[PDB]
Coordinates of C-alpha atoms and ligand atoms in Angstrom, one line a residue:
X1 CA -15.4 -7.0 -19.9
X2 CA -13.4 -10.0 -20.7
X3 CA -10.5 -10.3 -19.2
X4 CA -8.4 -12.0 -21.9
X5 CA -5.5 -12.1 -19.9
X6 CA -6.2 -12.5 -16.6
X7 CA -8.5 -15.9 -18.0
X8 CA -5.4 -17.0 -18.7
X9 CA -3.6 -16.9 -14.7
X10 CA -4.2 -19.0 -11.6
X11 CA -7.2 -16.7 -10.3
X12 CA -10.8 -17.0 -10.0
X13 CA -13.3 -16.4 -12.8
X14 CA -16.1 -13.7 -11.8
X15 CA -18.6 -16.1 -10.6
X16 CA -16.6 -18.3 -8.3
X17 CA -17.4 -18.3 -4.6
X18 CA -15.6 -21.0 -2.1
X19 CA -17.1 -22.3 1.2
X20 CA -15.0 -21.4 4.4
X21 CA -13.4 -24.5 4.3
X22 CA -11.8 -24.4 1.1
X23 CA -8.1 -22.6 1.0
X24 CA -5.7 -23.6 -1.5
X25 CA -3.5 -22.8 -3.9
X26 CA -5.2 -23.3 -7.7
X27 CA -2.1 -25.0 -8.9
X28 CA 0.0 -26.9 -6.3
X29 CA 2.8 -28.9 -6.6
X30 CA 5.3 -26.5 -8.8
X31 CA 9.0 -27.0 -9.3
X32 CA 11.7 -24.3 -9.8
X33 CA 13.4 -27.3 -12.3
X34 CA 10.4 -26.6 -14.9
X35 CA 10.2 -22.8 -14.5
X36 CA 11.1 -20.9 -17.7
X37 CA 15.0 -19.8 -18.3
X38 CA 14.5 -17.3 -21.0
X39 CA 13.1 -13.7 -20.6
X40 CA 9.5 -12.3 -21.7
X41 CA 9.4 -10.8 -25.3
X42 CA 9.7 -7.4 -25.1
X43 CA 8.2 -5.6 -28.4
X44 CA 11.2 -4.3 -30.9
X45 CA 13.7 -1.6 -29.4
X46 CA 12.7 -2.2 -25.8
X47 CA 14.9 -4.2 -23.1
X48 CA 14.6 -5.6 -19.8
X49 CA 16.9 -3.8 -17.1
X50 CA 17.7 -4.4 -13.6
X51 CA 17.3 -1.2 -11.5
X52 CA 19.6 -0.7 -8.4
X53 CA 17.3 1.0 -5.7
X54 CA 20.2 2.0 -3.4
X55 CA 21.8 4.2 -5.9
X56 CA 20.6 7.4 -6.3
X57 CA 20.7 7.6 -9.8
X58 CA 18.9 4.5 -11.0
X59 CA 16.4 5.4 -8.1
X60 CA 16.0 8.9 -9.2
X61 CA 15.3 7.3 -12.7
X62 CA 12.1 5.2 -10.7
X63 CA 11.1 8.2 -9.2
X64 CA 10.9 10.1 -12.3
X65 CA 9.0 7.8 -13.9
X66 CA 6.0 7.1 -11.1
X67 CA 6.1 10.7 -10.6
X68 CA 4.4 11.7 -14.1
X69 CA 3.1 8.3 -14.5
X70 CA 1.4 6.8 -11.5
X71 CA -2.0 6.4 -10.5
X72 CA -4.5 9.3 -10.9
X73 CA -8.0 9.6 -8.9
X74 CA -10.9 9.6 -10.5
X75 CA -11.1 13.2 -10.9
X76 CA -8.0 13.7 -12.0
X77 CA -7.3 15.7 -9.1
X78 CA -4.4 13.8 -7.9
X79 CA -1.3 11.7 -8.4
X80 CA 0.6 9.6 -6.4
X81 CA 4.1 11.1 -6.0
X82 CA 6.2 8.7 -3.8
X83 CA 9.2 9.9 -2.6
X84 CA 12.9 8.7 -3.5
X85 CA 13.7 8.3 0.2
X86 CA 10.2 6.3 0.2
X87 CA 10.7 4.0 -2.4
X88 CA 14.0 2.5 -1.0
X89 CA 12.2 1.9 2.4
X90 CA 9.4 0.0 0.6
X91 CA 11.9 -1.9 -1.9
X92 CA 14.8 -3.0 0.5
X93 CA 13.0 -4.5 3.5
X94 CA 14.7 -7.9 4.7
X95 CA 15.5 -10.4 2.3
X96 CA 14.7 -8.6 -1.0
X97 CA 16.2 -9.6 -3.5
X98 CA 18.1 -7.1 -6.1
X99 CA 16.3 -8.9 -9.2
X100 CA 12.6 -8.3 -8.1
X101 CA 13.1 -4.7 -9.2
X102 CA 12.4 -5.2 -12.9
X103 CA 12.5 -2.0 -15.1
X104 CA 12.1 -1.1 -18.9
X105 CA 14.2 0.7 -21.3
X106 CA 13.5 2.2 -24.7
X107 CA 16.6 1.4 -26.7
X108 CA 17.2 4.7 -28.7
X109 CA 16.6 7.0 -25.7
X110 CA 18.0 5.0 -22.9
X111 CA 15.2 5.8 -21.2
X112 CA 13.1 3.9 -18.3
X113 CA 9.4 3.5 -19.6
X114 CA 8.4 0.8 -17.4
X115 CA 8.6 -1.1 -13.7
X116 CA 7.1 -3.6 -11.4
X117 CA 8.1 -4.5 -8.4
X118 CA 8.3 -7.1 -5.6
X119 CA 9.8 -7.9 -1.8
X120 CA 9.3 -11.1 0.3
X121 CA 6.6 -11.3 3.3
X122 CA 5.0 -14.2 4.9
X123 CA 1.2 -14.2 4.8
X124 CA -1.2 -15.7 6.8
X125 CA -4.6 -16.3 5.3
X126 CA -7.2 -17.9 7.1
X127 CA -5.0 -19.4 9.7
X128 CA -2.1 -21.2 7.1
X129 CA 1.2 -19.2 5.9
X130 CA 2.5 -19.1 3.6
X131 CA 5.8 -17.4 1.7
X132 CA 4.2 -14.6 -0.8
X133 CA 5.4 -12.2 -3.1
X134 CA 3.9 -8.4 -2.5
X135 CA 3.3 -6.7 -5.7
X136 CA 3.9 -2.8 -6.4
X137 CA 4.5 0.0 -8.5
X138 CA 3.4 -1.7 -11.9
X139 CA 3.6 1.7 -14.3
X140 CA 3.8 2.2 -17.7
X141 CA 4.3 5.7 -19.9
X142 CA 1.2 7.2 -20.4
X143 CA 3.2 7.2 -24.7
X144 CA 2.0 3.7 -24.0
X145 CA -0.8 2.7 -22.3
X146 CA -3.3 0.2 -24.2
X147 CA -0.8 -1.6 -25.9
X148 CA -0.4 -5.0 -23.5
X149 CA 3.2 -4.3 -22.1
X150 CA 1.7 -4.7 -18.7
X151 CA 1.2 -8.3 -19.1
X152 CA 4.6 -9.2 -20.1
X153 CA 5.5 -6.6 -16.8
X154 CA 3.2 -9.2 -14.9
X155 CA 4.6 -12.6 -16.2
X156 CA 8.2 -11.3 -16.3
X157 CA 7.9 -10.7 -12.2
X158 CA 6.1 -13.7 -12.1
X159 CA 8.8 -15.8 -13.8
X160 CA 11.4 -14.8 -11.7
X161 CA 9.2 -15.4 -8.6
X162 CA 8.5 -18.5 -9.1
X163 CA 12.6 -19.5 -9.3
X164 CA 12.9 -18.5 -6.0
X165 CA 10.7 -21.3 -5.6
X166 CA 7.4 -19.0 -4.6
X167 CA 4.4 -19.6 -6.2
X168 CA 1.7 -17.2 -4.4
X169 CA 1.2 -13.4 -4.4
X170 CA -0.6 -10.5 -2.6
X171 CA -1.5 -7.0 -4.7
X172 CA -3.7 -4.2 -3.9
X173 CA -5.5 -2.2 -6.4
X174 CA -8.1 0.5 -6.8
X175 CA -9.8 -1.2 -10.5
X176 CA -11.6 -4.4 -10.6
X177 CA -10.0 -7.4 -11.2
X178 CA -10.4 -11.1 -10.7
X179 CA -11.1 -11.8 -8.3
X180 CA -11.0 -10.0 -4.6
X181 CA -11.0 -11.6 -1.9
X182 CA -11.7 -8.0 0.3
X183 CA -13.0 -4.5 -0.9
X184 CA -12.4 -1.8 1.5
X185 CA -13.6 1.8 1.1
X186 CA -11.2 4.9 2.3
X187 CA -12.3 7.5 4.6
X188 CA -10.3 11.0 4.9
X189 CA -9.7 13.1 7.8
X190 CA -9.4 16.9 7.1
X191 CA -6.9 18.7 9.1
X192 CA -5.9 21.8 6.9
X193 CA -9.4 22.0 5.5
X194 CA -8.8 25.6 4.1
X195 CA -6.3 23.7 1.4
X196 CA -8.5 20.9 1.0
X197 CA -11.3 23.6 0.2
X198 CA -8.8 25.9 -2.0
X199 CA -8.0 22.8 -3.9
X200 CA -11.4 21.8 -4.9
X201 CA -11.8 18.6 -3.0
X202 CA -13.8 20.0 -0.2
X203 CA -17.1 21.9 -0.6
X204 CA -18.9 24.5 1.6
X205 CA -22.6 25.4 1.3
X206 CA -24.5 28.1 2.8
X207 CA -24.6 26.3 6.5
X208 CA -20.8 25.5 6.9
X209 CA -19.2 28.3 5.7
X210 CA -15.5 28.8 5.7
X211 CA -15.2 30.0 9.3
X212 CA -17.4 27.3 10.2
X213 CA -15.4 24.5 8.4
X214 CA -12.3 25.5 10.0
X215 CA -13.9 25.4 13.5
X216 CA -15.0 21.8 12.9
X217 CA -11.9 20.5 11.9
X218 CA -9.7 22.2 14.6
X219 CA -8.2 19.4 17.3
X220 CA -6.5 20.5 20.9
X221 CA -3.0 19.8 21.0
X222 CA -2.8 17.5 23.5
X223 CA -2.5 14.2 23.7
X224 CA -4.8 11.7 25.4
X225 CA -2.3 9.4 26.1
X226 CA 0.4 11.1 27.5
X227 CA 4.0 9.4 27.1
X228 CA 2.9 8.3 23.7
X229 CA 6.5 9.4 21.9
X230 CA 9.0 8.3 19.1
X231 CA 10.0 4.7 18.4
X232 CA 13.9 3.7 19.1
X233 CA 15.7 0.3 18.9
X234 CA 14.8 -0.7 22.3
X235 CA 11.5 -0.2 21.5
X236 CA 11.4 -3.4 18.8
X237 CA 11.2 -6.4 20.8
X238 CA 7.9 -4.6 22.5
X239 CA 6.6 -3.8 19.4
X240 CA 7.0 -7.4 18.1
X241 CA 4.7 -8.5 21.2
X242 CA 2.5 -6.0 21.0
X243 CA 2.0 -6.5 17.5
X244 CA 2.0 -9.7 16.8
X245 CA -0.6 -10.7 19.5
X246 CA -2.7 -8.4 17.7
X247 CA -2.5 -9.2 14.4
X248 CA -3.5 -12.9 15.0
X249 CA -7.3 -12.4 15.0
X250 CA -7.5 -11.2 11.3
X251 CA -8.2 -13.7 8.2
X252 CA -5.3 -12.4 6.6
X253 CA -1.8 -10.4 7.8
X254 CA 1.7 -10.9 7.4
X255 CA 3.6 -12.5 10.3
X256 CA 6.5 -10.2 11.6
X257 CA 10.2 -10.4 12.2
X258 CA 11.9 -8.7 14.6
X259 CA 14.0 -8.0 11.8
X260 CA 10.7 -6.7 9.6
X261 CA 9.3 -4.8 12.8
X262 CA 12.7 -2.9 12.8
X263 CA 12.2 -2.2 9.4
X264 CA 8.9 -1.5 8.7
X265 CA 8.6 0.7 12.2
X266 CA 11.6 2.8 12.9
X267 CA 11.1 6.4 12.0
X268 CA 12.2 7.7 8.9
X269 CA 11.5 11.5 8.8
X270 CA 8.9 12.2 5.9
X271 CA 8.7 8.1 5.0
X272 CA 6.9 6.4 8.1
X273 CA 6.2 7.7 12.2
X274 CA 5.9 5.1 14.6
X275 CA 4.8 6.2 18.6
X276 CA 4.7 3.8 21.5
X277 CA 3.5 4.1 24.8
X278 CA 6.1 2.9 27.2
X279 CA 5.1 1.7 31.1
X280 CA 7.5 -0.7 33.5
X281 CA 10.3 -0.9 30.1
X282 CA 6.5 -2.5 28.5
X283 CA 5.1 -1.5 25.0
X284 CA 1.3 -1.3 26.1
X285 CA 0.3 1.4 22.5
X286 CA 1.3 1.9 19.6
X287 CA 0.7 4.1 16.8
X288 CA 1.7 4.5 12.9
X289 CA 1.2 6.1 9.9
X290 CA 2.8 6.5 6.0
X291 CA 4.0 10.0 4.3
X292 CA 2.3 9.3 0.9
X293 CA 2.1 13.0 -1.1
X294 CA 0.6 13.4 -4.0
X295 CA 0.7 16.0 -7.0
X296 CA -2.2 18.7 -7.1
X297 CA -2.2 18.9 -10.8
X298 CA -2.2 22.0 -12.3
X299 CA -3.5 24.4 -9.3
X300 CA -2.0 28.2 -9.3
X301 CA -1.0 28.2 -5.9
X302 CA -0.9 24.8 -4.7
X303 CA 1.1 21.9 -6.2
X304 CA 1.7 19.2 -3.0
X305 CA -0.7 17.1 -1.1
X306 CA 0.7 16.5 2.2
X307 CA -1.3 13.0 3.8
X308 CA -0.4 10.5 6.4
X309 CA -1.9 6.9 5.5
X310 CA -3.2 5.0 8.8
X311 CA -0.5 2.2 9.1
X312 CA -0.8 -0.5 11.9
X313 CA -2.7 1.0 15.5
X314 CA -3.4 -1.5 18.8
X315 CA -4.1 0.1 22.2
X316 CA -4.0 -1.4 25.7
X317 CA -4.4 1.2 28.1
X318 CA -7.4 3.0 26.4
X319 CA -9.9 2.8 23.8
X320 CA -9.4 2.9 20.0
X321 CA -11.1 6.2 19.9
X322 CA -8.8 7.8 21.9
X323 CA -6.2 6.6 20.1
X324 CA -7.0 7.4 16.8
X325 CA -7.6 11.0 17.8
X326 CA -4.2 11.1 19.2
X327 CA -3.0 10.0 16.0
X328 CA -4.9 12.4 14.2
X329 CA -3.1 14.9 16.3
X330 CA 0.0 13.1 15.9
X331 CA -0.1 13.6 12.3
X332 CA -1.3 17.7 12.6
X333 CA 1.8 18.6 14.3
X334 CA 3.8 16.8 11.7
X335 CA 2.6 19.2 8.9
X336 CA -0.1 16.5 7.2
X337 CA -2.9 18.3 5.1
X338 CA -5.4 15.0 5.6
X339 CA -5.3 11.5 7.7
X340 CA -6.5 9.0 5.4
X341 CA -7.3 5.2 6.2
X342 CA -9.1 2.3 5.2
X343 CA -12.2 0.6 6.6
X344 CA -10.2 -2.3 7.7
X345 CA -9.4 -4.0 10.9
X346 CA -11.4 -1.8 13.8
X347 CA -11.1 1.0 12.1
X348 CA -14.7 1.6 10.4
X349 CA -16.0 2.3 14.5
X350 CA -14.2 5.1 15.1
X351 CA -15.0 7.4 11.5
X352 CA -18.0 8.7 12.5
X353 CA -16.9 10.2 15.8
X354 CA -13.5 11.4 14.4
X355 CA -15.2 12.9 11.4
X356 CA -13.8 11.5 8.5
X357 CA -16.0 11.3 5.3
X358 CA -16.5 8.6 3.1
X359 CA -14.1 8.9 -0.2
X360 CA -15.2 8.0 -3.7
X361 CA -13.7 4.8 -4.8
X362 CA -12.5 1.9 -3.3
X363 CA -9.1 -0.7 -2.6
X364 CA -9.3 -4.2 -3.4
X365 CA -7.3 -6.9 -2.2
X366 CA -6.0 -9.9 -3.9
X367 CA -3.7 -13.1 -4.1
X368 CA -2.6 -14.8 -7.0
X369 CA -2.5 -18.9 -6.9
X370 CA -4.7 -18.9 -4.5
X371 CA -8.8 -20.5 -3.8
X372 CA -10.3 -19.4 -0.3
X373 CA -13.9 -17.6 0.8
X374 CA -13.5 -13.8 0.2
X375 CA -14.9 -11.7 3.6
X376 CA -15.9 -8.4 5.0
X377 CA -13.1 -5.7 5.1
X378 CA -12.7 -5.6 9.0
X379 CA -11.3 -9.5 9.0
X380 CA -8.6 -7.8 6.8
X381 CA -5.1 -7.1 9.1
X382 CA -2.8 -5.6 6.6
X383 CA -2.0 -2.5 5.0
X384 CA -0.1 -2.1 1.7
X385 CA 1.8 0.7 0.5
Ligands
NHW1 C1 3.7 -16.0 -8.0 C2 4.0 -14.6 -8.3 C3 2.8 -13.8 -8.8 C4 3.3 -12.4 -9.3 C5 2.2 -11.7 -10.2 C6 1.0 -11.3 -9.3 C7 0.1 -10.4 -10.1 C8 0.4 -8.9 -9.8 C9 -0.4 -8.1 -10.7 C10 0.1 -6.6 -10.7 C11 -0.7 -5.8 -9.6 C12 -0.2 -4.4 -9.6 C13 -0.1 -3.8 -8.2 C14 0.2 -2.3 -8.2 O1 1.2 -1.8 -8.8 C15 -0.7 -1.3 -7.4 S1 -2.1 -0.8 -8.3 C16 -1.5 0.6 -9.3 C17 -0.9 0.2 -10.6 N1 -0.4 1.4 -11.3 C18 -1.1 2.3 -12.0 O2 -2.4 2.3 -12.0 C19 -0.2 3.3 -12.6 C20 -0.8 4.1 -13.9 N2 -1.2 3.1 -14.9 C21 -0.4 2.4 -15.6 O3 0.9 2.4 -15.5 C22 -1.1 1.4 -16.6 O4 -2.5 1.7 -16.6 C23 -0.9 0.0 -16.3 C24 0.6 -0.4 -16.5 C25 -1.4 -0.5 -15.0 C26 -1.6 -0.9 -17.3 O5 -1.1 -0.8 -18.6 P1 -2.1 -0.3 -19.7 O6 -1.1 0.3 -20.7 O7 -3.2 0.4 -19.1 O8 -2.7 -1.7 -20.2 P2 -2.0 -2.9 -21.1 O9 -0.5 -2.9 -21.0 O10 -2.7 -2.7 -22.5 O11 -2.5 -4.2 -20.4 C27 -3.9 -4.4 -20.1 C28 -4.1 -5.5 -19.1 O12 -3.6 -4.9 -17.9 C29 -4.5 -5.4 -16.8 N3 -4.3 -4.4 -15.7 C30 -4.6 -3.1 -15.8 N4 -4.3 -2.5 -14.6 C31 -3.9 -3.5 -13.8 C32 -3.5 -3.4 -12.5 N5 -3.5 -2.3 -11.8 N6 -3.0 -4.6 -11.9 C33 -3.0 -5.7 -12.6 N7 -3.4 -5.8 -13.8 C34 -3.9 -4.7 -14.5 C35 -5.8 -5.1 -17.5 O13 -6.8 -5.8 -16.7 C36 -5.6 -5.8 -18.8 O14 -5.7 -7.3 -18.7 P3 -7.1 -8.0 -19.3 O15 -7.0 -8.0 -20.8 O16 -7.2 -9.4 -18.8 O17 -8.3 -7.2 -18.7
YN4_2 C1 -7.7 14.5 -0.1 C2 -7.9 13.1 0.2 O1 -7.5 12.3 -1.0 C3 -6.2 11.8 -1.2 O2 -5.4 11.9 -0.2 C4 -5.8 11.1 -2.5 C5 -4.5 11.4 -3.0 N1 -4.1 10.9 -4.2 C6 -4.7 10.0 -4.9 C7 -4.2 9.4 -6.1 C8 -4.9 8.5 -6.8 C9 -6.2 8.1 -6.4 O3 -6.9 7.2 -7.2 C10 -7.7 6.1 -6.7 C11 -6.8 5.1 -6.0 C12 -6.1 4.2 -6.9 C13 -5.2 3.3 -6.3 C14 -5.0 3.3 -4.9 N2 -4.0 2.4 -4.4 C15 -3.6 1.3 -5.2 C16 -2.5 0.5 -4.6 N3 -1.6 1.3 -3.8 C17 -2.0 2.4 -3.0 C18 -3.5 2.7 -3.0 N4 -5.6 4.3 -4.2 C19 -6.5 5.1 -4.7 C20 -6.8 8.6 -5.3 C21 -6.1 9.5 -4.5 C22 -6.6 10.2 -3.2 S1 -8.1 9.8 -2.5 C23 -8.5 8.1 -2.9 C24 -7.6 7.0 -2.2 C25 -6.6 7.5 -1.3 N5 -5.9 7.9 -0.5
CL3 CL1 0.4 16.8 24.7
MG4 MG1 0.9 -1.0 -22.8

């Protein structure tokens, strides 16, 4: 393919490969005084309109959309169905700013059509930081695909970045773009394999039949570690310690707040679970994962997905194994169908002996504006939504 647009943008062509050594942005030395004051063309009866994510209604509106137009698998087995409650937790973290949340109308309709979005994170890669813009929920109608609106979406977002005098980016995608600088595969963890069966995704054969698949799957209810329990506000200051101390041996991660460890940690029923382990008033473990359902389409009897999404997991006081199969149970007795997670940070060790199996695609990670050696998915130490 060609990639007429994206030929166009500060990233790397195809064939480039940097040495260790190199790690800069393609274009340096912007100014907010030359940044374009006018907005992106938008094609006859279409206009640009901000969206308000803490009111209901223009949220609802959002949420509408992504729900019958968001990413598909493959297979079309699935789609992505982020919550309403979710998609205020993931658009309002600290510092975000009400104008990032770009959506499109069609004028005769009043109908939204189109969205992107983006929130402010520091991100360290290889060892510098540097302020970024984290890009999400890019959809368009299915009425419209194929007919370049999302490059206007794209330079629109991009534009309006840039005036806030940022001039880098981080985005995650399952298709291939120029150019990644990480590919991780996912891995899934069956917990109500009966569903997973009924569904179509899983498959029995003559050896494991369907007595014998639930048997595998089935975890005892008790926890290897304990105290391991709910996340409060006295718990942040630990977790921003335990945490950050962590993070730091990973090519790239965002650097956290207190503020942002608040945020991005404290429960939120049927958004994001957060358990610590607590000895002498110390946060020594700490597990998390994401409530990301997703539509069954067009299946009699079911029509939900329930999964948790491996978030951010560091243990002190035992090994990763144990943990993750504490989180694994963590997630069963909140009403999760699967555990899902990436290959990245330690997390490929522990598959094989949890039982997860290899999924069919892959996530790709990438920056815009900016040149640096790509590497090997377990040197990766962040997780986007
Ligand atoms: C300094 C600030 C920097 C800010 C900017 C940073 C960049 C952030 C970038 C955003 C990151 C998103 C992160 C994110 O949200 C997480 S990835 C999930 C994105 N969402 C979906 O897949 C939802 C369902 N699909 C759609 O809505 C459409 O397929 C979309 C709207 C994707 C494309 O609409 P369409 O009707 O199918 O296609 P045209 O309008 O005709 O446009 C075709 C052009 O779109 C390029 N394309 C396709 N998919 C893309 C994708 N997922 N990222 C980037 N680019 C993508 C494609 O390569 C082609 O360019 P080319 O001709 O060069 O090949
Ligand atoms: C039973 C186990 O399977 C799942 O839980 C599931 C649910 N909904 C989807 C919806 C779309 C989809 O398409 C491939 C894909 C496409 C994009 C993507 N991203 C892009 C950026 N944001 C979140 C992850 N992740 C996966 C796969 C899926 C999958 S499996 C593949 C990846 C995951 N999770
Ligand atoms: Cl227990
Ligand atoms: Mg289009």
């Amino acid at each position: 393919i060609d990639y007429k647009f994206w030929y166009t943008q500060p990233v790397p062509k195809i064939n480039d490969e940097f040495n260790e050594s190199v790690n800069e942005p393609f274009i340096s030395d912007n100014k907010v005084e030359d940044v374009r004051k006018d907005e992106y063309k938008l094609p006859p009866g279409y206009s640009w309109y901000v969206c308000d994510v803490k009111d209901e209604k223009d949220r609802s509106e959002i949420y509408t959309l992504l729900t019958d137009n968001y990413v598909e698998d493959d297979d079309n087995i699935f789609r992505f169905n982020y919550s309403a409650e979710f998609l205020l937790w993931a658009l309002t973290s600290p510092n975000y700013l009400k104008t990032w949340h770009i959506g499109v109308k069609y004028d005769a309709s009043n109908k939204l059509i189109g969205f992107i979005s983006a929130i402010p994170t520091d991100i360290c890669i290889h060892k510098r930081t540097i302020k970024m813009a984290e890009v999400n929920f890019l959809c368009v109608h299915k009425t419209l695909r194929s007919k370049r609106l999302a490059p206007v979406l794209i330079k629109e977002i991009t534009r309006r970045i840039n005036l806030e005098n940022i001039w880098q980016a981080i985005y995650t995608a399952g298709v291939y773009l120029p150019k990644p600088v990480s590919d991780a595969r996912y891995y899934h963890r069956s917990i109500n394999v009966k569903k997973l069966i009924e569904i179509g995704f899983s498959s029995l054969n003559s050896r494991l039949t369907m007595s014998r698949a639930i048997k595998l799957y089935r975890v005892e209810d008790t926890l290897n570690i304990k105290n391991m329990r709910l996340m409060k506000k006295k718990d942040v200051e630990g977790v921003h310690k335990l945490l950050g101390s962590y993070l730091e041996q990973f090519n790239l991660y965002a650097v956290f707040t207190k503020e942002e460890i608040a945020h991005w940690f404290l429960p939120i029923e049927n958004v994001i679970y957060t358990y610590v382990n607590e000895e002498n008033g110390k946060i020594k473990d700490m597990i998390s994962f994401y409530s990301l359902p997703s539509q069954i389409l067009g299946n009699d009897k079911y029509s939900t997905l329930n999964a948790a999404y491996s978030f951010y997991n560091v243990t002190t006081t035992a090994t990763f194994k144990q943990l993750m199969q504490d989180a694994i149970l963590l997630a069963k007795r909140n009403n999760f169908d699967v555990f899902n997670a990436l290959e990245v940070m330690q997390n490929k060790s522990v598959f094989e002996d949890l039982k997860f199996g290899e999924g069919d695609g892959s996530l790709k990670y990438y920056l815009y504006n900016w040149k640096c050696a790509s590497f090997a998915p377990a040197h990766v130490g962040i997780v986007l939504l």
